[PDB]
Design a protein around this ligand. Structure first.
Ligand code: ZN
Ligand code: ZN
Ligand code: ZN
Ligand code: ZN
Lengths: 109, 105, 81, 971, 75, 111, 55
RNA sequence: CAUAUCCUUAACUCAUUGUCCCUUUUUUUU
């Protein structure tokens, strides 16, 4: 009962500058536990954020109710983030040793 | 056509197939696109009348209703000797028209 | 720049199709080798140019045609590079 | 719920099923390396660009990781946990994580008065400047345009990418002026931007979940415009383009499918075989069947572009590979797709292709056996009627499978054998047809959709050969065929409809028209519309091919009654009942004469019922059956009809009025103008206010009627009437349909034959002051039309006088109509070349470039007319004026000049044209040189043989000899 | 259509409009300032390089511009 | 009398099933000749055998019995010779005899 | 590496045709040979002008 | 350089139906 474009990651516009880390986590942590928060440093990106939820349904709910919230006298614009690209190589050696340790652990193959 | 720079002719070795023209294209020259003075009959290469395509329009590709000719001026300049004159790509103009009407309609 | 490169691809397309079209960077050697070879073919084709050459040299026509075919390989000497 | 849902254009994501959604899972990969870059140099270490072996390691590693999770599932996605260092792969570098605090642990209001705030006014949602509306779901693609920043502050890379971002916004959302300018500028500055910065912003836009198909179309238009630019700089981006374009090869929309093909073939020509082969190698054995499907589709396209011998070794290597059957399946699917795409082209390689596929018919994996049979069927269809000797190798496993297998293998094997039967000669064809006929009799029962689609086709293919007997067909094929296939559910699918009508026509060739038509005639009265439509088509084609000599008198009442019933009971508004009616009654010929009272009464009655569609169809039926009443010699009745349709002229529905006019057009043709009732005196002044009607169907059918009266019947109207009707025709030139415009131009010549060229010509010359170009171009053509039909000495003086009018469009207009005039009169134009030579040399000296391009068009057409007639002094004089325009750069003017020179080559000879080029072929500037070289090539192509006598003498240098010594021979 | 006029020819009306705009704007341009070319275009005779402009609307809009004003005061 | 347009050499199959016309260099065309049921001559579309940079001295049709028609040629390739500044490649390039077979089953001409 | 105008003018059979820029040619000997051949017409003079033709 | 606008050119066009069937351990029963 969800559309395919729903994501754990939220993109946030109209965020008042130099808001605290605590206030951020308190605002977004109501809907669920939070995997990670990234806040834009560079001045072109400054004032916007990405929030990753540990749960997909909480992120769904935070989009559904979070939008248009009033923080620091401004409306909050929330969207899903479309993770459409990858920025680094997937480091085959680490993934290889990780899979070797799992397969060694449970005698799979 | 002469009006579309991005269209491209087949130009393979023409054969015994006669090229045809749909009602919209009836009476015009395949190369220079004129309405007057028809001189020679158009022959198309084997691949271009393969199968279902046998008998479609040379210039656009619709159901063909009459034979295609070269005009006199294309004969004198020997433009009738360059190859199969079937147009092998739709081009930008045809595609744009489709998406525009489909957007509206 | 890109227009230079599109002109370049178009002209090498032509040159493959009709042997002996030039472009902006045809050297002297290339142009003259083309017109030598075209001349030889033309001589072979026309019957009376070939008669004239077979009379002016006292040769038979088969010898004349065979020598012209031998000259088609390097008609103007070796390539100038 | 939105109420606007009716109004918005739909998305691509809505029509997609579960299978298609897989293209939204794919993400853009990281940077890939180009091996050929810088002459294949030694790769620089620590570049972090993926090579081929990195890609294959990642692919193998994810296959293994899913095997692991599938194993660990049985013991005990977006939901899955996300590691801290891999997450960093999901975000751009601009942002820094926050540390979680410690206090975070994971797990009415009354009346108040307000304070003034300015802050809500300050925030903006749209970019500043002349930028289009930014939709809310595009924000994360164009967010950098929202914040405002001085250009000088940021780096050249960041200003370059901001520039690209603005251009892309104008291409997506702009008005057509913005869209045109931005498109042009991203094409011209493409190489300067570089292939990198374009694609890493174009490709995220095509991955978006909210595209409409016109926006997708505009984006892929951007991609194939820049693909001509950076022809060799797209190699690191080949695979990234494919996963964003390969979905278009299976798009349900035909033009999307074609433009996906054209951009993959251009991408193949830009990257070359080796890059394409290396890039697509991984996708052959991929774990998803979506990627494998579309890669197999795309290799077919790459083989069309580069040619089959190029990738035939690679393809053989991929079909033999015995580690994975997915790769074998995919290779055989590529061969099938090549045969579907290439058609006739595959024949020179047929024995190379079959030998790749032969080992698949006997494979242990059943999907592979099925695809090998389907690939054989594709190849045998493409090779018709050649290659029977190439397919001798697979006739044995195919046969063995048909006798042996039962079930789902049988459909594919039976299809393959049905296509191989027409390839083979009569002695073996008569063998194979009999046993496969016995299989098809058994399979008529089968309630399985693929088996029905197969056995209709195979019935047709075995019915072509002569080894079947007509008695055998009507005794044993025909009753179960009409019991199992002529059903209502067969008629609903279009492929089944079409196959069914083809096969029944082919049966009628062998058996006879009466035997087929008598089994289906009573279903012209069936009350399912689509069914009746199918039955109508079959009868139509049978009586079109075989005629009606076989149809006795008892069946023709069935037939006439059935087509009248079907005609009266239509709703779907298409031509099938109309074409069917015409074909049947023309086939019947004079036998239909007793039925004409019934038909006339029916049509006459339905011409006035309440439905516009019914009246329209009735007038269409008159236009089809007008000829039958001439052959049936019943001109009195058709004469009466003409009198009746004349009162229906006052119709207010334009569709009905156009059909009334079409019907009238047919009656005038069949009976003639001089016996026409109501007389042409009554009909033409009725028609002149019908000209005003702006509907295209009305205008089209009325102009033809008016123009035909204008020549064959001009004494039925006064000269003032032809003059005012002539004036009215100037509004017909604003029509959108081109046929209306060329019928209108013709009518001007016919009228000028009656009221004389001067009254007509003054009107046409006055019309050149109009601003819009479509009016003026057509007026120009009509001036030439009259000039040709009433000889050019009549309209010349006034047209040449109009060149002195101080208005630009009039002067371009006179030049344009001279261009058409010389094209039309041809050889007869040697009489007026001296007259118009000074006019053209005035135009070729002109400051306006257009004045020069139209004068060059006049020179081209005048040049070819006087070929062989000794007018070379005028033409050589005009060459002296045409030739300095070779350094123009505008393309329209540049191609008019080249056309003029190609016309002049055939009129004043190759020698003059070479004498013009000679000095600039080796000129120091590339500008003068390439223009000069592309004139030389045109002379060379057109007249390569004549130039042997005309080349100059080049002297020998030190080591090369350049004198042609043979010509120097003296006798 | 004689007794009471019917319809209107919008193409010829647009031709008339171009003439009336021309007459209006031309009456504010002195005869030395503008030179009318052979094809109906107009050149500015003040400015030393004689730019040529397609309509009188463009000539008036040119004469507003700053390049013309600077070139004007020298003459 | 162009250099690449065929017409210079003309060879017929000794049984009468095909005819082959070729230019001095890089352009050959085979026509398949047949008889219809009213004993009239019928012609097909041309099958082409093109080989770039290649001179033809003579072309004759080979008398294979009723097998696939063969045509023999006195070819020469000038491609290498135009890329040797020393002029050796002109000296030691050699004429070849090549046989073209018209594969009547697959409707194409193979060298 | 390239000729000056004086050596070029003496090396032509006919030195009246040589111009300032002919030495900049990639094959200057053939260029001045072709400029001095009979009945050939010279390159239009405005190829080097900055102002557009007839403007 | 970077932005609108005006004028003009090309007998420039007025939507389309053309196997996308590809997909699930999936297979019409004596
Ligand atoms: Zn057409
Ligand atoms: Zn033509
Ligand atoms: Zn073709
Ligand atoms: Zn001024």
């Amino acid at each position: 009962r969800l559309p395919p474009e729903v994501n754990r990651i939220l993109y946030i516009r109209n965020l008042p500058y130099k808001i605290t880390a605590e206030e951020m986590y308190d605002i977004f942590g109501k809907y669920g536990p939070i995997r990670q928060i990234r806040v834009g440093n560079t001045p072109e990106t400054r004032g916007t954020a990405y929030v990753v939820y540990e749960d997909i349904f909480d992120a769904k709910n935070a989009c559904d109710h979070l939008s248009g919230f009033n923080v620091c006298n401004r409306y909050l614009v929330v969207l899903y983030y479309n993770a459409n690209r990858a920025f680094q190589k997937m480091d085959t050696k680490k993934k290889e040793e990780q899979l070797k340790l799992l397969k060694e652990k449970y005698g799979i193959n | 056509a002469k009006h579309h720079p991005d269209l491209i002719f087949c130009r393979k070795q023409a054969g015994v197939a006669i090229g045809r023209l749909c009602e919209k294209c009836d009476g015009k020259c395949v190369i220079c696109d004129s309405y007057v003075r028809p001189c020679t009959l158009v022959r198309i290469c084997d691949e271009c009348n393969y199968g279902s395509y046998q008998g479609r329009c040379v210039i656009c590709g619709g159901p063909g209703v009459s034979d295609a000719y070269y005009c006199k001026e294309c004969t004198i300049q020997e433009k009738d000797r360059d190859g199969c004159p079937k147009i092998v790509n739709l081009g930008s103009s045809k595609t744009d028209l489709f998406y525009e009407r489909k957007k509206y309609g | 720049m890109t227009d230079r490169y599109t002109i370049h691809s178009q002209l090498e397309h032509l040159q493959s199709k009709y042997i002996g079209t030039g472009h902006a960077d045809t050297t002297k050697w290339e142009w003259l080798v083309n017109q030598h070879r075209d001349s030889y073919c033309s001589y072979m084709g026309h019957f009376d140019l070939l008669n004239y050459f077979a009379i002016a040299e006292n040769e038979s026509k088969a010898r004349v045609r065979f020598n012209l075919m031998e000259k088609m390989l390097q008609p103007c000497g070796p390539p100038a590079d | 719920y939105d109420p606007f849902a009716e109004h918005r254009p739909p998305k691509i994501a809505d029509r997609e099923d579960e299978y298609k959604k897989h293209r939204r899972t794919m993400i853009i990969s990281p940077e890939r390396l180009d091996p050929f870059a810088d002459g294949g140099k030694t790769p620089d270490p620590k570049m972090n660009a993926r090579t081929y072996m990195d890609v294959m390691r990642e692919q193998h590693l994810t296959k293994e990781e899913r095997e692991i999770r599938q194993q660990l599932a049985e013991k005990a996605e977006r939901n899955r946990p996300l590691s801290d260092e891999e997450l960093d792969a999901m975000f751009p570098e601009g942002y820094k994580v926050l540390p979680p605090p410690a206090g975070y642990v994971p797990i009415m209001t009354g009346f108040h008065m307000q304070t003034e705030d300015r802050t809500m006014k300050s925030v903006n949602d749209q970019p500043s400047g002349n930028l289009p509306f930014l939709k809310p779901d595009d924000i994360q693609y164009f967010d950098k345009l929202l914040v405002d920043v001085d250009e000088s502050t940021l780096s050249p890379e960041e200003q370059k990418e901001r520039k690209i971002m603005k251009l892309l916004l104008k291409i997506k959302n702009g008005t057509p002026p913005m869209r045109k300018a931005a498109l042009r500028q991203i094409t011209d500055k493409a190489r300067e931007f570089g292939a990198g910065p374009l694609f890493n912003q174009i490709l995220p836009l095509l991955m978006s979940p909210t595209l409409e198909d016109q926006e997708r179309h505009l984006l892929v238009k951007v991609i194939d415009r820049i693909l001509y630019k950076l022809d060799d700089l797209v190699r690191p981006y080949v695979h990234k383009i494919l996963v964003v374009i390969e979905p278009l090869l299976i798009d349900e929309d035909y033009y999307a499918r074609v433009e996906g093909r054209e951009i993959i073939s251009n991408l193949a020509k830009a990257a070359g075989l080796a890059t394409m082969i290396s890039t697509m190698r991984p996708d052959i054995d991929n774990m998803d069947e979506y990627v494998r499907n579309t890669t197999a589709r795309a290799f077919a396209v790459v083989a069309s572009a580069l040619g089959i011998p190029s990738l035939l070794p690679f393809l053989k290597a991929v079909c033999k590979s015995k580690k994975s059957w997915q790769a074998r399946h995919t290779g055989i699917k590529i061969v099938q797709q090549i045969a579907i795409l290439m058609g006739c082209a595959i024949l020179p390689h047929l024995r190379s292709l079959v030998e790749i596929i032969e080992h698949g018919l006997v494979d242990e994996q059943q999907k592979v056996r099925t695809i090998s049979a389907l690939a054989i069927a594709a190849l045998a269809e493409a090779a018709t009627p050649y290659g029977i000797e190439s397919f001798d190798s697979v006739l044995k496993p195919l046969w063995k499978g048909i006798r042996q297998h039962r079930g789902k293998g049988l459909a594919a094997f039976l299809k393959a054998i049905g296509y191989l039967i027409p390839l083979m000669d009569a002695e073996y064809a008569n063998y194979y047809t009999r046993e496969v006929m016995l299989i098809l009799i058994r399979e008529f029962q089968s309630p399985d959709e693929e088996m029905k689609k197969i056995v209709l086709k195979v019935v047709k293919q075995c019915c072509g050969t002569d080894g079947v007997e007509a008695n055998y067909i009507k005794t044993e094929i025909l009753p179960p065929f009409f019991k199992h296939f002529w059903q209502h559910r067969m008629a609903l699918d279009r492929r089944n409809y079409r196959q069914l009508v083809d096969t029944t026509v082919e049966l009628a060739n062998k058996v006879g028209a009466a035997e087929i038509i008598s089994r289906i005639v009573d279903d012209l009265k069936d009350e399912a519309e689509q069914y009746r439509k199918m039955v109508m088509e079959t009868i139509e084609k049978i009586m079109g091919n075989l005629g009606a000599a076989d149809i006795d008198h008892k069946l023709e009442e069935q037939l006439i009654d059935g087509i009248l019933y079907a005609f009266q009971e239509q709703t779907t508004e298409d031509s099938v009942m109309l074409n069917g009616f015409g074909t049947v009654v023309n086939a019947l010929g004079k036998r239909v004469k007793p039925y004409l009272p019934q038909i006339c009464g029916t049509v006459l009655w339905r011409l006035n019922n309440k439905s516009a569609k019914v009246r329209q169809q009735a007038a269409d039926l008159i236009s089809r059956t007008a000829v039958v009443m001439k052959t049936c010699q019943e001109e009195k009745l058709m004469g009466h009809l003409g009198v009746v349709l004349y009162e229906y002229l006052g119709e207010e529905y334009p569709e009905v009025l156009g059909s009334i006019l079409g019907a009238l057009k047919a009656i005038v043709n069949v009976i003639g103008m001089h016996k026409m009732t109501p007389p042409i005196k009554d009909l033409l002044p009725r028609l002149t206010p019908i000209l005003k009607n702006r509907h295209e169907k009305v205008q089209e059918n009325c102009i033809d009627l008016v123009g035909r009266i204008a020549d064959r019947g001009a004494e039925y109207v006064s000269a003032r009437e032809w003059m005012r009707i002539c004036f009215e025709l100037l509004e017909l030139l604003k029509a959108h349909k081109k046929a209306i415009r060329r019928a209108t131009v013709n009518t001007f010549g016919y009228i000028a034959k009656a009221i004389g060229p001067h009254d007509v010509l003054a009107t046409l010359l006055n019309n050149l002051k109009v601003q819009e170009r479509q009016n003026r171009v057509c007026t120009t053509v009509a001036i030439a039309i009259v000039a040709e039909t009433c000889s050019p000495f009549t309209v010349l003086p006034a047209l040449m006088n109009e060149y002195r009018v101080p208005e630009l469009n009039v002067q371009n207009g006179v030049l344009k109509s001279l261009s058409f005039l010389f094209e039309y009169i041809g050889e007869m134009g040697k009489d007026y070349i001296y007259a118009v030579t000074p006019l053209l040399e005035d135009a070729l000296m002109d400051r306006d470039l257009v004045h020069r391009q139209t004068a060059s068009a006049v020179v081209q057409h005048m040049s070819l007319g006087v070929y062989g007639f000794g007018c070379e002094d005028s033409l050589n004089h005009l060459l002296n004026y045409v030739w300095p325009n070779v350094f123009e750069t505008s393309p329209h003017v540049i191609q008019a000049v080249m056309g003029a020179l190609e016309g002049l080559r055939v009129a004043i000879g190759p020698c003059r044209m070479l004498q013009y080029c000679l000095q600039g072929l080796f000129h120091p500037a590339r500008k003068v040189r390439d223009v000069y070289w592309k004139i030389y090539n045109s002379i060379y192509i057109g007249s390569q043989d004549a130039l042997i006598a005309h080349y100059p003498r080049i002297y020998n240098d030190d080591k090369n000899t350049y004198i042609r010594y043979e010509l120097d021979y003296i006798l | 259509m004689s007794f009471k006029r019917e319809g209107d020819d919008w193409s010829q009306l647009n031709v008339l409009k171009k003439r009336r705009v021309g007459d209006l704007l031309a009456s504010y341009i002195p005869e030395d300032e503008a030179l009318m070319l052979r094809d109906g275009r107009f050149a500015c005779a003040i400015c030393p390089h004689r730019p040529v402009l397609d309509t009188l609307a463009m000539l008036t809009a040119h004469r507003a511009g700053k390049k013309h004003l600077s070139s004007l005061q020298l003459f | 009398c162009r250099r690449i347009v065929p017409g210079q050499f003309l060879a017929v199959d000794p049984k009468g099933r095909a005819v082959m016309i070729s230019a001095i260099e890089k352009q050959k065309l085979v026509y398949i000749l047949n008889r219809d049921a009213a004993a009239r001559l019928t012609i097909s579309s041309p099958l082409e055998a093109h080989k770039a940079n290649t001179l033809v001295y003579h072309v004759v049709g080979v008398d294979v019995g009723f097998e696939n028609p063969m045509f023999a040629c006195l070819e020469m390739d000038y491609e290498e010779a135009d890329n040797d500044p020393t002029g050796e490649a002109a000296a030691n390039t050699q004429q070849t005899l090549t046989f073209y077979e018209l594969d009547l089953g697959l409707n194409h001409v193979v060298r | 590496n390239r000729f000056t105008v004086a050596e070029l003018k003496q090396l032509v059979a006919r030195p009246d045709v040589v111009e300032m820029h002919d030495v900049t040619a990639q094959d200057p000997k053939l260029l001045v040979h072709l400029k001095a051949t009979r009945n050939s017409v010279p390159v239009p003079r405005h190829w080097c002008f900055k102002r557009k033709y007839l403007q």
